[PDB]
Design an enzyme around this catalytic site. Structure first.
Site, PDB file in Angstrom:
ATOM      1  N   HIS A  45       7.063  16.968  11.964  1.00 17.90           N
ATOM      2  CA  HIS A  45       6.154  16.905  13.105  1.00 17.90           C
ATOM      3  C   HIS A  45       5.160  18.060  13.147  1.00 17.90           C
ATOM      4  O   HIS A  45       5.193  18.959  12.308  1.00 17.90           O
ATOM      5  CB  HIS A  45       6.947  16.854  14.416  1.00 17.90           C
ATOM      6  CG  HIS A  45       7.836  18.040  14.632  1.00 17.90           C
ATOM      7  ND1 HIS A  45       8.917  18.314  13.822  1.00 17.90           N
ATOM      8  CD2 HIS A  45       7.787  19.032  15.549  1.00 17.90           C
ATOM      9  CE1 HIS A  45       9.497  19.429  14.234  1.00 17.90           C
ATOM     10  NE2 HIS A  45       8.830  19.883  15.280  1.00 17.90           N
ATOM     11  N   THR A  48      -0.209  17.884  11.555  1.00 23.21           N
ATOM     12  CA  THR A  48      -0.835  18.104  10.256  1.00 23.21           C
ATOM     13  C   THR A  48      -0.060  18.863   9.186  1.00 23.21           C
ATOM     14  O   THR A  48       0.791  19.709   9.482  1.00 23.21           O
ATOM     15  CB  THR A  48      -2.174  18.829  10.455  1.00 23.21           C
ATOM     16  OG1 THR A  48      -1.951  20.021  11.221  1.00 23.21           O
ATOM     17  CG2 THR A  48      -3.162  17.931  11.195  1.00 23.21           C
ATOM     18  N   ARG A  49      -0.399  18.555   7.934  1.00 25.44           N
ATOM     19  CA  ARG A  49       0.218  19.172   6.763  1.00 25.44           C
ATOM     20  C   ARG A  49      -0.839  19.404   5.680  1.00 25.44           C
ATOM     21  O   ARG A  49      -1.664  18.536   5.405  1.00 25.44           O
ATOM     22  CB  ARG A  49       1.315  18.262   6.210  1.00 25.44           C
ATOM     23  CG  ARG A  49       2.544  18.136   7.105  1.00 25.44           C
ATOM     24  CD  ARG A  49       3.322  19.440   7.092  1.00 25.44           C
ATOM     25  NE  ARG A  49       4.585  19.391   7.831  1.00 25.44           N
ATOM     26  CZ  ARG A  49       4.685  19.456   9.154  1.00 25.44           C
ATOM     27  NH1 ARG A  49       3.595  19.565   9.902  1.00 25.44           N
ATOM     28  NH2 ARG A  49       5.883  19.440   9.732  1.00 25.44           N
ATOM     29  N   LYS A 265      -4.691  25.683  14.326  1.00 25.00           N
ATOM     30  CA  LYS A 265      -3.238  25.727  14.239  1.00 25.00           C
ATOM     31  C   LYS A 265      -2.881  26.768  13.181  1.00 25.00           C
ATOM     32  O   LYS A 265      -3.478  26.790  12.104  1.00 25.00           O
ATOM     33  CB  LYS A 265      -2.710  24.347  13.841  1.00 25.00           C
ATOM     34  CG  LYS A 265      -1.222  24.270  13.580  1.00 25.00           C
ATOM     35  CD  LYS A 265      -0.857  22.866  13.109  1.00 25.00           C
ATOM     36  CE  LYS A 265       0.479  22.838  12.392  1.00 25.00           C
ATOM     37  NZ  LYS A 265       0.716  21.511  11.748  1.00 25.00           N
ATOM     38  N   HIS A 269       4.412  31.896   7.355  1.00 20.88           N
ATOM     39  CA  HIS A 269       5.266  31.313   6.321  1.00 20.88           C
ATOM     40  C   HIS A 269       6.433  32.137   5.773  1.00 20.88           C
ATOM     41  O   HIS A 269       7.500  31.590   5.486  1.00 20.88           O
ATOM     42  CB  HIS A 269       4.359  30.884   5.158  1.00 20.88           C
ATOM     43  CG  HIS A 269       5.028  30.018   4.137  1.00 20.88           C
ATOM     44  ND1 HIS A 269       5.583  28.795   4.444  1.00 20.88           N
ATOM     45  CD2 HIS A 269       5.177  30.172   2.799  1.00 20.88           C
ATOM     46  CE1 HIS A 269       6.039  28.231   3.342  1.00 20.88           C
ATOM     47  NE2 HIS A 269       5.805  29.046   2.329  1.00 20.88           N
ATOM     48  N   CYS A 315       9.872  23.939  14.205  1.00 19.41           N
ATOM     49  CA  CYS A 315      10.230  23.033  13.128  1.00 19.41           C
ATOM     50  C   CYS A 315      11.043  23.794  12.079  1.00 19.41           C
ATOM     51  O   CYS A 315      11.113  25.021  12.121  1.00 19.41           O
ATOM     52  CB  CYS A 315       8.931  22.411  12.601  1.00 19.41           C
ATOM     53  SG  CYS A 315       8.846  21.947  10.852  1.00 19.41           S
ATOM     54  N   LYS A 348       3.472  17.647   1.183  1.00 18.61           N
ATOM     55  CA  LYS A 348       2.345  17.193   0.384  1.00 18.61           C
ATOM     56  C   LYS A 348       2.781  16.330  -0.800  1.00 18.61           C
ATOM     57  O   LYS A 348       2.012  15.490  -1.263  1.00 18.61           O
ATOM     58  CB  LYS A 348       1.548  18.401  -0.126  1.00 18.61           C
ATOM     59  CG  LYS A 348       2.337  19.291  -1.096  1.00 18.61           C
ATOM     60  CD  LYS A 348       1.515  20.496  -1.556  1.00 18.61           C
ATOM     61  CE  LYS A 348       1.391  21.548  -0.468  1.00 18.61           C
ATOM     62  NZ  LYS A 348       2.687  22.252  -0.245  1.00 18.61           N
TER      63      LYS A 348
HETATM   64  C1  LIG Z   1       8.414  23.011   9.483  1.00 22.06           C
HETATM   65  C2  LIG Z   1       7.185  23.111   8.794  1.00 22.06           C
HETATM   66  C3  LIG Z   1       7.210  22.591   7.541  1.00 22.06           C
HETATM   67  C4  LIG Z   1       6.021  22.488   6.793  1.00 22.06           C
HETATM   68  C5  LIG Z   1       4.781  22.912   7.382  1.00 22.06           C
HETATM   69  C6  LIG Z   1       4.770  23.483   8.716  1.00 22.06           C
HETATM   70  C7  LIG Z   1       5.960  23.594   9.427  1.00 22.06           C
HETATM   71  C8  LIG Z   1       5.956  24.189  10.817  1.00 22.06           C
HETATM   72  N1  LIG Z   1       3.565  22.801   6.750  1.00 22.06           N
HETATM   73  C9  LIG Z   1       3.613  22.233   5.493  1.00 22.06           C
HETATM   74  C10 LIG Z   1       2.363  22.084   4.869  1.00 22.06           C
HETATM   75  O1  LIG Z   1       1.285  22.417   5.367  1.00 22.06           O
HETATM   76  N2  LIG Z   1       2.396  21.492   3.566  1.00 22.06           N
HETATM   77  C11 LIG Z   1       3.548  21.064   2.885  1.00 22.06           C
HETATM   78  O2  LIG Z   1       3.495  20.571   1.783  1.00 22.06           O
HETATM   79  N3  LIG Z   1       4.729  21.238   3.550  1.00 22.06           N
HETATM   80  C12 LIG Z   1       4.745  21.792   4.784  1.00 22.06           C
HETATM   81  N4  LIG Z   1       5.985  21.928   5.460  1.00 22.06           N
HETATM   82  C13 LIG Z   1       7.257  21.526   4.711  1.00 22.06           C
HETATM   83  C14 LIG Z   1       7.481  20.003   4.797  1.00 22.06           C
HETATM   84  O3  LIG Z   1       7.181  19.555   6.176  1.00 22.06           O
HETATM   85  C15 LIG Z   1       9.007  19.833   4.523  1.00 22.06           C
HETATM   86  O4  LIG Z   1       9.326  20.301   3.226  1.00 22.06           O
HETATM   87  C16 LIG Z   1       9.319  18.179   4.613  1.00 22.06           C
HETATM   88  O5  LIG Z   1       8.993  17.594   5.803  1.00 22.06           O
HETATM   89  C17 LIG Z   1      10.708  18.068   4.100  1.00 22.06           C
HETATM   90  O6  LIG Z   1      11.025  16.613   4.162  1.00 22.06           O
HETATM   91  P1  LIG Z   1      12.506  16.006   4.357  1.00 22.06           P
HETATM   92  O7  LIG Z   1      12.367  14.595   4.251  1.00 22.06           O
HETATM   93  O8  LIG Z   1      13.443  16.855   3.646  1.00 22.06           O
HETATM   94  O9  LIG Z   1      12.888  16.447   5.936  1.00 22.06           O
HETATM   95  P2  LIG Z   1      12.618  15.470   7.274  1.00 22.06           P
HETATM   96  O10 LIG Z   1      11.259  14.972   7.175  1.00 22.06           O
HETATM   97  O11 LIG Z   1      13.076  16.410   8.336  1.00 22.06           O
HETATM   98  O12 LIG Z   1      13.618  14.314   7.128  1.00 22.06           O
HETATM   99  C18 LIG Z   1      15.072  14.404   7.196  1.00 22.06           C
HETATM  100  C19 LIG Z   1      15.504  13.243   7.986  1.00 22.06           C
HETATM  101  O13 LIG Z   1      16.888  12.942   7.788  1.00 22.06           O
HETATM  102  C20 LIG Z   1      17.528  12.702   8.996  1.00 22.06           C
HETATM  103  N5  LIG Z   1      18.926  12.990   9.123  1.00 22.06           N
HETATM  104  C21 LIG Z   1      19.492  14.227   9.171  1.00 22.06           C
HETATM  105  N6  LIG Z   1      20.788  14.202   9.237  1.00 22.06           N
HETATM  106  C22 LIG Z   1      21.107  12.873   9.231  1.00 22.06           C
HETATM  107  C23 LIG Z   1      22.339  12.153   9.287  1.00 22.06           C
HETATM  108  N7  LIG Z   1      23.529  12.792   9.354  1.00 22.06           N
HETATM  109  N8  LIG Z   1      22.321  10.781   9.268  1.00 22.06           N
HETATM  110  C24 LIG Z   1      21.120  10.140   9.200  1.00 22.06           C
HETATM  111  N9  LIG Z   1      19.889  10.755   9.142  1.00 22.06           N
HETATM  112  C25 LIG Z   1      19.969  12.127   9.169  1.00 22.06           C
HETATM  113  C26 LIG Z   1      16.612  13.255  10.138  1.00 22.06           C
HETATM  114  O14 LIG Z   1      16.678  12.558  11.383  1.00 22.06           O
HETATM  115  C27 LIG Z   1      15.261  13.362   9.498  1.00 22.06           C
HETATM  116  O15 LIG Z   1      14.436  12.314   9.995  1.00 22.06           O
END
Ligand SMILES: *Cc1cc2c(cc1C)nc1c(=O)[nH]c(=O)nc-1n2C[C@H](O)[C@H](O)[C@H](O)COP(=O)(O)OP(=O)(O)OC[C@H]1O[C@@H](n2cnc3c(N)ncnc32)[C@H](O)[C@@H]1O
Ligand SMILES: [Cl-]
Length: 385
Positions: A45, A48-49, A265, A269, A315, A348
């Site tokens: 969330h 933007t990324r 924003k 890091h 986040c 990304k």
């Molecule tokens: C936090 C952050 C990260 C970030 C960024 C700015 C912030 C504040 N800016 C970025 C940027 O400009 N460019 C870029 O390339 N990356 C940037 N990041 C990092 C990037 O957002 C993270 O690396 C990425 O989102 C990681 O993806 P992943 O798929 O690993 O994580 P998720 O999207 O959180 O999805 C995990 C999902 O799994 C679910 N979940 C968790 N536990 C369970 C269980 N037990 N059962 C079922 N589902 C589960 C979650 O609900 C979640 O949806």
């Protein structure tokens, strides 16, 4: 409730992309998520990324970055949701004192990427809202930019569901039962089986991979971002202010231009609080560092954007010891694919990773070079219970 070809646990950044790739190939797919993606409890969330191409963190990264860019453009043409805006990305730092900038320039050279090199007053003259010391140098990448992350996940979900993918929301996976011929997941809402399993639970990978007999060190971090009232004549995307990721004396910062007056924003890091994904305080401002670390950068380098805090967001990052990703088959089970430890810079690549995960799950191999993300690499410190 029944059998599926493939089950994806964690339908977030990586999982939803894998789900789309699988569904597009006619694979009976089930995606399970603890919440309702896109949501604000994970790591995708914040609107933007940034996507960059001159990735010096590793040469294997550039090709994946370029493939991902093409995939993002493809997604843009398939959905009505906005996916990408070509803001360009500016990288700067003290001359000869930044490994981040140096490797970025090296990556640009080695892959013949299109970039502009400038330094000192040239930076300030091209982008009025930026004030850097004269000993600073920069590399501007005109063809990279900003992705609207929540739109990306929403688009992949709608497209996957239209093709038969099933998405089970608000369902937390609690345990796994892996056999050499099939997999089974247990949840409060029931158990499900499939031929293949893809694990992509983000920050929760640090607490549940042990259930798969994996002992890999993963550390979740609380990372905040703030939106600031800014001089729209200098920091708006409309006047070509770029996205950026820079290295200054106290660390690395990344930011985005104001879109439709939402404000600049910014995020710090290099620092974050070590936390548990289940007890993390998701309120911005509860720690003095949240806002102070951001304004320290703004008043010095982008004074015109050091305005009123319009809104903040909390986040998570999930880091590995070497800060490189983990994308590989389970060392003991060829029917289990792992996607974890994106260490704060994986969004990304989500489109490209989705393609990689689908290939690994269906054939056990992938056309992309993912050797640097091996789950068997030394620097990781991987072991079994
Ligand atoms: C936090 C952050 C990260 C970030 C960024 C700015 C912030 C504040 N800016 C970025 C940027 O400009 N460019 C870029 O390339 N990356 C940037 N990041 C990092 C990037 O957002 C993270 O690396 C990425 O989102 C990681 O993806 P992943 O798929 O690993 O994580 P998720 O999207 O959180 O999805 C995990 C999902 O799994 C679910 N979940 C968790 N536990 C369970 C269980 N037990 N059962 C079922 N589902 C589960 C979650 O609900 C979640 O949806
Ligand atoms: Cl992450």
């Amino acid at each position: 409730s029944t059998h599926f070809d493939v089950i994806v646990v964690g339908a977030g950044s990586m999982g939803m992309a894998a789900g789309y790739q699988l569904a597009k190939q006619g694979v009976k797919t089930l995606l399970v998520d603890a919440f309702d993606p896109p949501h604000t409890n994970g790591s995708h969330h914040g609107d933007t990324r940034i996507i960059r191409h001159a990735y010096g963190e590793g040469r294997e990264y550039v090709p994946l970055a370029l493939r991902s860019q093409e995939l993002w453009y493809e997604l843009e043409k398939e959905t009505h949701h906005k996916i990408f805006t070509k803001t360009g990305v500016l990288v700067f730092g003290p001359k000869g004192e930044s490994a981040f900038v140096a490797e970025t320039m090296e990556a640009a050279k080695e892959h013949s990427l299109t970039v502009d090199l400038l330094e000192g007053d040239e930076i300030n003259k091209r982008w009025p809202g930026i004030t850097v010391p004269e000993n600073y140098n920069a590399i501007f990448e005109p063809n990279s930019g900003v992705l609207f992350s929540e739109n990306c996940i929403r688009a992949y979900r709608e497209l996957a569901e239209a093709r038969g993918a099933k998405v089970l929301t608000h369902t937390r996976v609690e345990d796994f039962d892996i056999s050499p011929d099939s997999v089974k997941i247990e949840t409060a809402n029931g158990s499900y089986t499939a031929d293949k399993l893809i694990v992509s639970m983000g920050a929760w990978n640090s607490k549940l991979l042990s259930k798969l007999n994996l002992d890999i060190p993963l550390q979740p971090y609380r990372q905040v971002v703030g939106f600031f009232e800014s001089d729209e004549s200098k920091y708006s995307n409309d006047i070509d202010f770029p996205g950026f990721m820079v290295e200054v004396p106290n660390g690395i910062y990344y930011g985005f231009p104001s879109f439709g007056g939402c404000g600049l924003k910014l995020g710090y890091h290099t620092f974050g609080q070590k936390i548990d994904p289940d007890t993390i305080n998701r309120e911005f401002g509860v720690y003095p560092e949240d806002e102070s670390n951001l304004r320290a950068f703004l008043e010095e380098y982008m004074p015109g954007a050091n305005g009123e805090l319009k809104r903040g967001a909390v986040c998570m990052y999930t880091k590995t010891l070497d800060e490189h990703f983990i994308i590989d088959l389970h060392p003991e089970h060829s029917n289990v694919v792992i996607a974890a430890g994106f260490s704060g810079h994986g969004f990304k690549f989500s489109s490209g990773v989705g393609e990689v995960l689908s290939q690994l799950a269906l054939t056990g191999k992938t056309e992309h070079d993912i050797s640097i993300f091996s789950i068997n690499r030394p620097a990781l410190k991987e072991s079994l219970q």
